[PDB]
Each structure stands twice: as structure tokens, then as C-alpha cells.
Design a protein around this ligand. Sequence first.
Ligand SMILES: [Fe+3]
Ligand SMILES: [Fe+3]
Lengths: 68, 859, 859, 68
Amino acid sequence: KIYIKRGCLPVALDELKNVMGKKKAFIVTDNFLYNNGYTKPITDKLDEMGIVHKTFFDVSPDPSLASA
Amino acid sequence: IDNVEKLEKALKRLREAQSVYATYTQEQVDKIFFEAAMAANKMRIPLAKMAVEETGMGVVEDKVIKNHYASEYIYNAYKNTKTCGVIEEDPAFGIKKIAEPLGVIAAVIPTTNPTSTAIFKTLIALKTRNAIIISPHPRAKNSTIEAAKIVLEAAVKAGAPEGIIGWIDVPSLELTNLVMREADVILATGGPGLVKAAYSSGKPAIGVGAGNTPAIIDDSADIVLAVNSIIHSKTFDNGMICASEQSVIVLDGVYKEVKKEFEKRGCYFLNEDETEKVRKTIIINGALNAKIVGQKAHTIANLAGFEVPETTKILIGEVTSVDISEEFAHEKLCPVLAMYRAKDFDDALDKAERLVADGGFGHTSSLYIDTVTQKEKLQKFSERMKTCRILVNTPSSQGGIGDLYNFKLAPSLTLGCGSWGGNSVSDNVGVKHLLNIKTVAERRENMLWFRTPEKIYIKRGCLPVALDELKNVMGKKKAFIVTDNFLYNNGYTKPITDKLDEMGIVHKTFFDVSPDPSLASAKAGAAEMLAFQPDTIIAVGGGSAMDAAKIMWVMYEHPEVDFMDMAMRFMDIRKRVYTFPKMGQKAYFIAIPTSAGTGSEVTPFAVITDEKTGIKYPLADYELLPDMAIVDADMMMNAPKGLTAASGIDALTHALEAYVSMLATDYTDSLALRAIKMIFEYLPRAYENGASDPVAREKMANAATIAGMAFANAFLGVCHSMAHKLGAFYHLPHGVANALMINEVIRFNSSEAPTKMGTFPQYDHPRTLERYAEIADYIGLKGKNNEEKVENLIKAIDELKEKVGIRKTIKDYDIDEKEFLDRLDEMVEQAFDDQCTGTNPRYPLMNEIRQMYLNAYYG
Amino acid sequence: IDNVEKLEKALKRLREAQSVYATYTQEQVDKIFFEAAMAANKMRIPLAKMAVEETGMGVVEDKVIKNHYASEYIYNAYKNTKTCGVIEEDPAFGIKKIAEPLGVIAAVIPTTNPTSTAIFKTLIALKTRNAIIISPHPRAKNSTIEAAKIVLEAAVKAGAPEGIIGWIDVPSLELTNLVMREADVILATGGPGLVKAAYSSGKPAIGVGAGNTPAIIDDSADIVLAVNSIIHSKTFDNGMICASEQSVIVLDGVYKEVKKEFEKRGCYFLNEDETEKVRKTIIINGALNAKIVGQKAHTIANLAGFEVPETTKILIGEVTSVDISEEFAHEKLCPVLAMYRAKDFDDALDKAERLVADGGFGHTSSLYIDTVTQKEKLQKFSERMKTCRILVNTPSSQGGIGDLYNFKLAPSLTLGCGSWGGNSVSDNVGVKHLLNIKTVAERRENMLWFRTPEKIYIKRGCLPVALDELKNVMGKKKAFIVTDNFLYNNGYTKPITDKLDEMGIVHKTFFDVSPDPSLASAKAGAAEMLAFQPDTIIAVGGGSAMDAAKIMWVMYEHPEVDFMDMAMRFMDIRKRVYTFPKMGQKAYFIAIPTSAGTGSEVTPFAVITDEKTGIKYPLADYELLPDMAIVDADMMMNAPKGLTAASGIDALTHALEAYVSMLATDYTDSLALRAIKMIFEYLPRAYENGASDPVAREKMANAATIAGMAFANAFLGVCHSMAHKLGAFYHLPHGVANALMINEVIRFNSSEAPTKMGTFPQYDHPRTLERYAEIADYIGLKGKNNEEKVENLIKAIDELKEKVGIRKTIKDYDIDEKEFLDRLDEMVEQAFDDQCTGTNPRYPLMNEIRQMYLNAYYG
Amino acid sequence: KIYIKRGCLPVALDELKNVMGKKKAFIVTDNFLYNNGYTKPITDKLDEMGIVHKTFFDVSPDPSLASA
Ligand SMILES: [Fe+3]
Ligand SMILES: [Fe+3]
């Protein structure tokens, strides 16, 4: 399930509920990306469905074992 | 305004001023709204006094409360709403919603709320950059004009166009009917007989119904709360406001307590003579009396012909008849109330449903109940009642316009009733019903994908080492081999049967798969597996065997499936009407090919022919991917010359159509080009030398698998839609059927000006000639101007067909001409109705299909 | 069905079937929808062939596309949309929605889309549990009836009622008029005349408008994309589908390139004679020709009188005029096209607006632009175009029915054109337009609050310790003391100034505040504060001092505030029109009382008298809470006897009103009870002894502050509403005015059958008698049946008034009777229109207030 | 600003936007409450108002200094 073309993020994320039925999501991102709000569309989409999400942004470049 | 000509002049000036007001910003609208709200808020007492003096009905204090509500709660509700520009925006898509004013509104005003309704409507018209005509009632015109002037002066002082609000000085039927026919939208609140004209005026309208409001009191309820709420609601403004209780139904077990409380809190119960007098004085000639509305209970009693204590609040009459004959079942805007008795909750529900109909059908109803214990009764009441407002433990008069007792309910003085009441709102009319919503849409492209089966194994002699994965990473102990009779007879399952027997797996084999498999064989195989209870399904053989095994797997794991529903034409594979069931639980599928060019071990296609009509249905869904697609070259050696030629040509056609397809993405173009190069460079060597040249056979198998993936991710074109029918009508092999039509399709797709296009978001213009030129350049014909390259490619394909022993024309395959021309019409009709023609860049018509297929048959 | 009586019988059967259908569950409706979707999708080619053979215009393949669309895309837009029961559920409030069906739909089908529209309407009606009757066009009866049958015999087989779908076999004008008037809703397509009649019927109508569609092409756009999209949309189904590009506007920058691109791909540009012939053949007597719609360009040219190559697609004639007289400016349902030359973007917008307003007002328009580097032009286009659909870089025919080129747009025919075209839709008609939504509302209560100023300091001699915090903690530099003349002249501000001097803080004192503070004193104080710029404000004194200092603080922090706007009456303190500006930006507001019975150090109330009108304007908002209120008994040990008595009685009245308030809660109740007990126990000792009794003075201080808190959190009643006016009209002390009215107000409120009620959700039934009995029981009085207790309470209040030397009646304070009788009518009017009136647990009328005034005067 | 009576949580929380203007919220709660979805009424209103929020739910009975 490799998905291509623009604007495919919400359409691809539709499969989490309609086909798969998942309930809990754990976003792993970067502090630089999280501060500017690069996970905003994903969290907004997961809110449109009955999915609860938790974000973890304590990851640094050259990720060390402590963050893992 | 007392003449027609003045009316057109006023309408013209109002349209001119609205054309200016419609281009204001949010800040100016907020300023005007705030100033008008304050000006209307600080003049409640004089307006109420004027309304009471003019109409001669109602009480001053409740009118003051109504004015305060209509001037303050409206502002508190709609001060923070956005009604100017972009409301909703989704940058991922192209959607953009823009709010625009509605136009010039024509509003009518009743006598029940001469001033509060005018204030509310003027405020909501000012908020939405609209213009309004007020049509005052002939009996209460002065107060309405005064309220309109009060709002208008503040609006124009705040920086609004002068001619925003208009009004009719002396109203008449002709003037109102002319106003209604010219305005864009009509706001009707004047009751029936006028709302019907508004709806039959020829313009969009927003009207209101009204009528009887049943109230239910049952055993599990607070008697004091219910009685006092009913008294408050009924006595608010002498019951003149609509949406107030007109009848109360009390269950049998609490009748005495309710009657005692009603008597204690100051209500007078009528006896038979009093009931007769009251019911005779309420309705005159089948119509509500005009001198009884808004008057006190004492005045009603005096007019009826008797006397009551001066402190009586509600006249209550106990009745039994619910039909229209009873005169207490009618609506009445006065403190007279009717009381009913019920022996059970179902009887109360039946009674209340007769009282809502024929009266306030779709308006409102009330129920007093304990909402913690009696959960089922609440559901039953909610389901049964055909009213747009269902109130629980709330007074009806203040709950119909509810922002006082309940929140998240629109605070409106105009109450729609839905299709039940003969109007089109079904909600409290708010600020969102006076706006137009424009949708701006940007062109977006369809989402694509790239799906392949897992664990694709590519090397010689990999079959034993790969089959070692059983009982190593899994626990499969039962195998069901599906093969062909020819392969089974020559012992081609021996390398697999020996390997399975070496490990601890029992196996059963099925070898009743004829070429062009029939549905009966698939059903027999499914029944055999159902009797055998296998764990994994191994499909060995050519394309027909693998497709038949796929169908058997589908019928084995979901024995309730209907074949005719699966073979169903769809426009978009993601928007299928029929959804294939999930299939991964009862069996594990492995595909081992012996024929090369079919390439069905990496594709979702399972094309099979019918058992009765012999029609080829190409059913395809991504639930059919044969995971663990193993390719072994040593099993691919003993193929005769004809089979190799047909397989090679079929693989070449697969690669060509995958490259030129409309859904062809960049992830597949590389595979298509590589497969085309491989097939062109190595097919003759494998065809002539045979099994003595293992390199050619290995390269041909690899090219076939690559092209299989290529056309698995990108669907075919019209050549396959023609070749399927050609092979089903005259029993020709699939490869040679594809071979005889490729040149015509190449010449058909290559056209700068086609009659029809493919209708795809990303195929924005004909590009097929450039794609074929790219194919020619990659393969190395070195032509000129993108046209000679296509001709060179056609000539090269013809030469390749010559070198592999494919005859030039269909006529050379011993086909009678008369039967050909007799079946041509049916064959064209079936060819157009195929799944493969959907993704073709040109979308061929039937006449073009016939012309091309005749060209291919004649030369 | 070809006669009126047959139609009426059919309508009765339809209603009977819909009544049974309207109670189906979700699973059943899902099954009906699914089976109907298969039935409509399978028979896609036969219906297209039937329609093209019957109608005589159109192309078979595009009709097949439309038939496939109207089933597949409709099914996969609402397959899992909940529409049976509770769709919204908010447990915190009482809101719940039911989404009930609508009833009977009268469908009016056009001739351009006979089958697809019928399938779409039937499916959407089936999904919403409605019943539909179809009135086909006379020219295309059979195809529509056949499509309805194909859907119906599958819906019935799936488990649905029998006569859900009905149709009129032989349509007529009278039959259509009858079926429009007898149906619940009218869903109408087919352009003007029929929609005008549908809206002029008297029933809700959802109608379709139609008209032109201009396509703007500017300098910065893909020429190939724009040209090919326009060609595709225009040639789709020979252009009978609505919203097709009837004109094109191209700027001179790319005019020649666009012309070359059109010429390259199958188009014909007319000359002067051909344009004239085409103009004379499109329009006949100011109307569209019926023999030109749906045919190819070759046939149109043949009827015109010239010849064109058989492969031509579009005929284009260059025109400059854009008025109504031009025959190329109308909407043509044929492949004929008109080209316009525009100097710049503004000229193109002006022309497009003219085409939209003259013709397709509100339908749709198209723009081809670069959406990345032309934001301002795109925004101007979105703002100026008055069409419900605005498509950018999208073909109009496939863009209007949007599920192909843009998602998140409703896939549907039946496009509503909004109030611009004369129909109340302004959207794409879908499922949500065929439902009635019922609102279930449960009784909810307003939230309450407990707001007090921070840092309340309460002991004897705590003033120096409290003021020491001004430097060691906050760090202020400038102080502005406000007091009154008499309090200043006797040196009661000496300790404060001494402490400020010791701390080293510069201070300035303003003391020109007179009793009954006016606006002149407040303005002078604010001017002094502006000139001095203090960092903290210290308000020392009684009632006048705190109110004057609060007004000076407000005018000092926000000098643009109008006083007549803060003095406006509100129903809910949290829903008022005027919002107070935030305070505390500049200075603190420490408050030190020198009397007991005002409570102003803990309340948000202020009151001042205008100099000219001479009437008090109480105002209240929690932005006036004096932070760090200091209550020291040393500052107020030497008050005279009359002031002590008046203050004690005012505090007692505050506590009583706070207890019997509608907004009363436990927090205020405990404080009110304690204050009442302390006032009853210690007031005579303070009055008779004075400074010789410090314990009584301190207890009275604490009781006054506690009562202040109590009536700050819960508002007052009706005694203050008339006491303020009594004190203002005849110049009496506030406590004296309170004393003369509390006894009659207690009896007024104590009533089991009040004329009106306070209309507060928390106040279900009258309970003031029980509250007064609770007060009497807490004090220590004796009685029976909750009435003798209240009588004993009144007697005790009379005894307390007698002890502290307060007279019995108003007339005992030397007020003329003629003056009272000549000012009573104005005094009652002023008293009713007061802020304190709306909180009383018994809504007063004017006559009741006048009667209370007379009883107070005459005893 | 002590707020009482039932159904006052959304009305009180509305002040976070319509009065003050905050933009980031840090919810602190216990394991049991978070697992049983008792913070959902608050997070729903925060999402409706348009306020980013993050939840810490790692507190225990008789809390220690490590959790703080
Ligand atoms: Fe094939
Ligand atoms: Fe007071």
C-alpha cells in the first residue's frame, strides 16, 4: 500500500476507520516540525474520526538511544 | 406608501441601496449591528406601551420582556458569527465556502408580536447585509413602523445606506401580494391564509405554522414542577404567544394531585354549564373569536356569561372527546385550557398524536417525566411525536423560542415547522437561512497507488529453498495443489510433491482445470477444498490454472459469494458498488507459473469464462493478490514454440498497454520500458533455440513478471477488451488473439484530434503520440518528428510477429466471412461493455470499434 | 395513470406505502439501497440506447457514462451516512436530533437526462425513506418509466413496500399541476416555466435553475489544458448537459495561440456569412430552436445552409457585442461556441458579469489561471462572480457534477442556483435536503458564580499592617486618596497619610465628593487623576466615596467610555449588549469603609446621580470589584446614632434580599443567615452605647461585610428598586428608605399564588414563604404552619426599627400628600424600570408597585 | 471566578478564547480517568475552540517527586 499523488494524506487516512477500524494512534515527529505545526492536518483528520491520538516530539537529529 | 407606483419606487430605491450595502466589511457590519441592538434595547418600555395601546391586547410587562429578549439575546447569539467571506476552507482540497447576502427580503408581521418580531427581523437582516420590507398588520401598524424607524435611525447613523429598511404605510391585499411577487425572499409569520400565499407567490419563501401544543404528565413526574411550568407558560402574555400549551393529558394515577395543585395555585375549573358557555363563546362560525385573544380569564368569563373570582388565572375544562367535533381540541390564544385523562402511557401517546395532527402539525409538544428511570418512555415519546420541537420538563411558551431554559437552541421569534407544516425550514430560523453559500473548487488529481505481492522470489532452483519457509516461519500442515491435466500427467508436480513429503505436510491435488476454465470446475474445486479443509493453496501452471485457482479460493473461503455480482463494471476501483470480502484467514495462497507471458502471479485479475454462455468476465480486485509469488526458471523450459510465441506476444501487449494507459504512473513506466526492451531483445532467441538456451528463457520469464507487475498497477486498454472477445468467439489462443489487434490499437490511440477523450483528472490533453515516440526512442528505432518513430515501432512489431510465426491477418486463421459478419454486431456490443476499455486514452465508440476490427480482419 | 381520479388513487396508495416505509431500521434501508444500486448499475447500456433512440438527440456512450455515474457515484457517497435516528447527541446539554423522513416527493424530470436523473432521484428518495412520484417529459416517457421500474422491482424484492415509486404514464399540464399541489415537496428540474410553476403552487419546492457559463482565459494559464478541457466539456454528450461553456473570454496576450490550439484539434471558425446563418438558425422569434439541441456540429451546419468537414467538433463565431440583442450571447444547448476578446482582466470580468447577470444568473462560471502566482486575480474573480459554483482549471460539464475532477463536492444532478436564480437551494441537492430534523430539548439551569475581591483583611488596627504590603510586596510609588469633605476635615485620613509618608510614597488627596455623587465630581476627580497619574487608588469613606471613586477609576482608565451606555438594563449579566472594558491596567483600588451598611468594599455596584435629569443610575459589573478591601473597625467607631441605625437597617435589608433572591445558593445562604443573626443580636447595643462598646461595633462591621458579599454574589430584590427612587425623590437616607419598605415587600413576596413569576430556570415553584420561615427559625422565633413564623419575623423587624428610632410611615418624615400623589405615577414608572427588579422572585406589575407605595405612605 | 452548577464546564471553558485568548493547554490527570475517557469533554471543547493541548497522565495515588 504505497500511495502517491497530491492531497492523498486524508484519503489514505480514511482507510484507518472504514476498512481497518483502528482506535488509538501514536504520532512520532520532530521538535522542529512539531513547533511549526506539521502534524496539524493529521491530527485534524484523526479528530474527524473516533480515533484518539498521542504525539511524541522529543526526537533530535542523530537520534540517540535515550529518545528511543 | 399608499399607491402602487410609490411601491415600485420604494422597491427600486431599496434595491439600489442594497447594491451598496452588500459590499461592506466585517467591522462596519459589526458596528451597525451593535448600534442597532443598543438602540432597540434602550427603548423597550415605550414600545411595549405603544403596542398595548394600539392592539388593545396583551400585558405591558410581558411585552417588555419580549422586547428585551428580541433585542439582547439576538445580539448575544449572533455577535461572533462570520457572515462576510470565507467561512470554511480546506487547502488540501480545492473547496472554499464564501457567504454572500441573500437580496431584498419581504417580511410580514403579526399582531401577536407587533414590535419584537420587527426588531428581530430587522436585526438579522442588518447582520447579513440584506434589505427588508416590513408589511405591518392593518391593526398594529403604528408600533411596527415606530420600531422599524428606531432601528433604522441608529443603523444609518452607524454608517449604513439610507434606504435599507422600507415599510408600507397602509397595508392591503393588493399591496402585500405585489410586494411578495417582487422581493427575492419572503419571511412569513402572519399565520395561515398568508403563508400559503407566500409559498404560492412564485418566489422562495420562509414561513411558519402554528397550532395546538399537547402536554403530557405521567406517573413518574414532579407534580409541582409540571403544574407551575404549565401555569407560567400559559399565563405568559395571556397565552397570546404561539407555541403555548393548548391541552394537557394527565395519567390516571396522578389526576387528583394535579387537580389539587391547579386549584391551589389559582386556577378555576369549569363545570358542564360553564364548559358549554365557554366552548360556545370561543369559536364562532367555525373560526376563532377575534375578541377573545389576549384577554384575561375574567374577561373571557364575563363575555361567556358568568362570573369568576378576580384572581383566577387559568380556566380549565375537563373533556373527553378528541375529534374535531370537540371545540376544546382547537387552538386558542387565550388562558383557556383543556384537560384530558388517560389510563396508560400508550393511550396518552395515541391521544397526543391525534391532537398534534389537525392542529399544530410539526410545531411543538411537551412531556414531564423522570428522565433518569423512565428511559424507554422518553424514547417512545421522541419517536412517536411528529413535531420539530420536543420539550422535556420545560414550559412550552419559553421553550419554543428556547434560549432561556435550554441552550444550543436557536433564539428565534419565528419557528419553522418543516414539510409537516407546509414550509421548508424545520428549525428555528436563524442567521444561516439568510445567506447564499458559493463553493470555489480547484482541480485535484486522483490518488494513485503501487501494490505488489510480498515475497517475490527470483532465481533458478529456488523452489525447494523457498518452500522451506513452510514449517519454518509458519505452521502449515495441509496443502491443496491446483494444476492442469497436461502438467499433472507429465509429472510436473513431482518437484513439489517430493518437497512437501520431505517435510511434515499432507497434500491433495486437483487436476480438472481445462483451458479457458469453466465455473463448474471452480465450484468443484471449492467443494473439494471444503471437504478437505486445507491450510495453503498452491496454484501451479499457466494463466488459466492460476485464475481458476483464484476463483476456487474465493468460493472456498467465502462460500456465499455471487459470481455475477463480482463481474460488475465500475468507473473507479475505489468507488466499487460491490466490495470484495476480506480473504486471508482460511488459506494461504502460493503461485508457481509454468507458462511465461501470462504474468498472473502478480496481478489482481482472475478473468474466467462463463459456464453456459461462454462469455469472458475479467473480474479484478486487489484482494486477489497471490502473496509469495515464486518464479523459477528451471520449470519453464519445456514449452513448445507456439506457447512461447503466444506468451511473448501477450507479455509485449501487457507492457505496451501498461505504459500507454491513462492510469500509468511513473512507478510503472520504468518496468514497462524494461519489459519491452527485454521482450524485443530476447524473444526470437528463445523461440528458435528453445530449451537449449537457458538465458533466453530466464530473461523472458523475468520480462513477463516485470510486465505483469506493470499492468497490475496500471490497467489495460482496448486491445485486451477486443482480444478477450476474439478468443472467446473463435477459440483462438490468447496470445495470437492479442497479436492480431495491436497495430490497429497503436494507430487508433495515436491521434492529435480524437472524437472522445478518456475523462481522467491528470490526462488533461492527448499525449499518446509522445508516449509511443518515447517507446520507440528507448527501444532504438531513431525516426523523426514523433510520427515516423510510431511507424517504425509498428513495422518492428510486425517483424517480430513474423519471426515468431504469427500469421498476418485473422482471415488466415480459417474464419468464415459470413459468420464473421453475422456475429460482428454482437461481438462489438460485448467489446464495448468490458472493464479494460475504461482506462483507454481514447474511449472508443462502437462504430470505431467495428471499423478497426474489420480493418484487422481484412488487412 | 392518465386521468385525475387514477392519479388521486395512486397518491393515496403512495401515502399508505410511505407510512409503512417510514419506520424501517438502518439495516433494511441499507439492503434496499445496495440492491437498488446493483440493479441500476447493471442495466446501464440498455437504458442509454433506449433514451437515445426515443429522444432523437445525444450520443450513446456519454449517456452510458452518465448512467454509470448516477448509480456508482451516488451509492459511494451515502453508503454509510447515518439517517435513521439519533444523529447528534450532546449529554452535557439536553440536545438530541432525530432526522425523520419528509413524506411525498413530486419529481419533475427534464428531457436532456431522462434516465440518469430518474435513477439519481429514485435512489436518494429510497435512502431517506421517502416515496417518490415521477412526472416524465412527454418526449422521453418510456426511458424514464423503464429506469423507475428497474429500480422499483429490485427495491421491492430487497424487502421494501410495494408502491414506493410511482409514475404518470401519460403526462399533461393539468396532471402536473394536480400532482404538484397534492405532494409534500416538489423536486423540479427542467429549466424555467416548470420551476416557476412549481414555486407558484403553495408547497415547498427544490428547483433547478439554468443558464450561461462563461469561461475566462487569461495570460497566465496552460493554453493546452484550458483549450482541451473546454473542448471536452462542450463536446460531452453533444452539450445537452447544463453548465456547459456557452462562451469563452480570452485576453489578447494569448489570443492567437489559443486560436491556433483550437484550430489544431478539430474546430471550425465561422466567417461573416456563416455567423449570420448560425445566428438565424439558433434562435427563432426570440426563442431557442428545438431542432438544434443535441445534434453534432455537422448537422447544425447542414440546417444552417453550409457544409463543414465531417470530423469537425465545435463551431466558433467571433462576436464583440455582449448585450441581450446579440444572438450569440444566449445559452445554446449545442456544440456552437462564441469567442470574446478582452483587453485586460477587468474587461473580462465586466463581460463575464454581463453574461452571468443577463443569462445564467447564479449557476456557474469557469476560470483558467495559475493559482500560485495570481492570488489577487483569483480573489477578485471569486468576489465578483455571483454564481453558486466557481470552477478554476476544471471543465464545467464534469465540474458541476463534482466527484470526478474535485472531491468534497456533492456528487449530484439537480443543481440549485440560489436566490440569484429564484430557488432556495444554493447547493448541490443531496441526501441532507430530503430530511426533517426534530430537536429534543431537556431542562437545563444557568451556572452560578462566587466572585469576591482578593485579600480581604479583617481585624482591629490592621490598617497599618495591610498598607505595609503596598511597598514590601507590590512596590507602588504614587497614591490618590478619595474621600468626602466632612470625613476629611476631621482628620480621619491622618493614619493613612502617615503610613504612606513612613513608607515613602507620594500621595494626593481629593475630597470634593458630596452626598448623592454626581457626574461633575466624578469628572473633576478623573481630571485630577489624569493630571497626577497615580499608581494606586485608595477610596476611604461610606457609600458616596466608593461609588464616586469607582466612577473616577473607570473614567481614568478609559476616558472614552459613555456613561449612558453602562446604565443600560440587562436580563442576563453574561449576555448584556455592552461589555465593560478591562480594569486594573493602571492602578489598584484599595477600599476602606468608615460605615457599616453599604457593603461597597466587596460589591461590583456603583450608583451616581446625573446633574440635569436628577435620577440615580445604578450600574453593575464585576470589573468594579475593589481588590484588597480593608475592613478596620477603628476607622468607624465614632459614627452618630442616626447613621448607625440607617446603616444597620440597610445591611439587614441587603441580607434579606440576598437570601430570598432567585439566584440564591448555599454559599450566599450561609453568609446571609450569619449576617442576619449578627445584625439582630448586636445592632441595639451599637446604637444605644456607641464608641463605649467596641465589640458591638466590630460585630456590626463583620456583619455588614458578610451581607455585602452575600448580596454581591446574589443580586437584590424589589425593595431596593423602589427604595432608590423614594430616596432620590424626597432626599432620605438609603437605610431609612429601606426601613419603610421591607415589611410590605416581605408580605408581597410571601404568596402561594403570585400574579407573575420571576422566569428563572432554577426557580421552579414559589418558595419564598418557606425561606422566610427558615430565616425565622434560625433567628429563634416561634410559630406554626410557616405563616405565624413570617408574621413573627415582621413583628421582630418592627421592634428592631422601633428600638433604633426609625419612624413608622413615610408621612411621619414630613412629606406633603399632594406632592406624593402628583409624583407617584412617575415614581412607579421609574421604580419598575430598574436593574434590581428582574431578580425578584415575584415579577411586579406597575399597579402592585403603586399599591405598595400607597400602603407604605398611609401605613 | 468559582463556577458551580451542572453543565457549566463548556460554558466556563469558553472564556479561554472569548475573554482571555490562550493558545496552549497542558492537562494533568490520573491513569484511571484518562483510560476511562473522562478528559474527553474537555479536549472536545478545546478542539472546538481551536486550542492545542497535551495530556500528562502519569500520576499515582500519594504522588511522589519523580512524577512532579
Ligand atoms: Fe492478456
Ligand atoms: Fe443598598
